[PDB]
């Protein structure tokens, strides 16, 4: 099916959505999903999925760095949640020539986008507490 679509002008979107068996190793998964990734033009991955693929522990250590004596920016003076933007070099282990766009999502809170020539983040929000008795995040 992928091949037939490309013949007729199609563009392929791989929304990963990893299943339970595939969360065991980074190595077993990278191999199983490889052919699909390289035949894909637009890809969506979650924040937890992207880190799983590359250096998950390294990212975890980073978010728990609290500076010892003085803060380096006024931002670190304020104790707020982390919203790291992954630099383009970090994602280079996973780029290929036919990738037009890559989206990494952190809930509805942040959406990061990566393109062959540009990068960035779109700010968002979430208010599940406005309706406390009818809230489900399922879809």
């Amino acid at each position: 099916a992928i091949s037939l679509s490309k013949k007729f002008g199609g563009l392929v979107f791989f929304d990963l959505n990893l299943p339970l068996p595939l969360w065991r190793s980074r190595d077993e998964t990278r191999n199983l999903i490889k052919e699909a990734w390289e035949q894909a033009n637009i890809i969506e991955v979650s924040r937890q999925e992207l880190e799983f693929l590359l250096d998950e522990e390294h990212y975890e250590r980073k978010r728990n760095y609290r500076p010892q004596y003085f803060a380096e920016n006024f931002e670190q003076t304020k104790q707020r949640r982390d919203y790291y933007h992954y630099t383009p070099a970090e994602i280079a282990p996973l780029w290929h020539d036919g990738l037009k766009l890559l989206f990494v999502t952190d809930g509805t809170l942040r959406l990061h986008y990566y393109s062959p020539s540009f990068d960035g983040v779109v700010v968002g929000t979430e208010d599940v507490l406005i309706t406390p008795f009818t809230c489900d995040r399922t879809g």
Binding site: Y69, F70, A71, E72
Partner: peptide
């Protein structure tokens, strides 16, 4: 006092031991 309280505002942009003194004959 900690980091939450103090911050670095500005990013912006021959020497050694000469010796030890010798005691003195003329103390006065």
């Amino acid at each position: 006092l900690s980091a939450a309280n103090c911050s670095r505002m500005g990013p912006f942009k021959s020497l050694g031991p000469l010796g030890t003194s010798l005691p003195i004959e003329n103390f006065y």
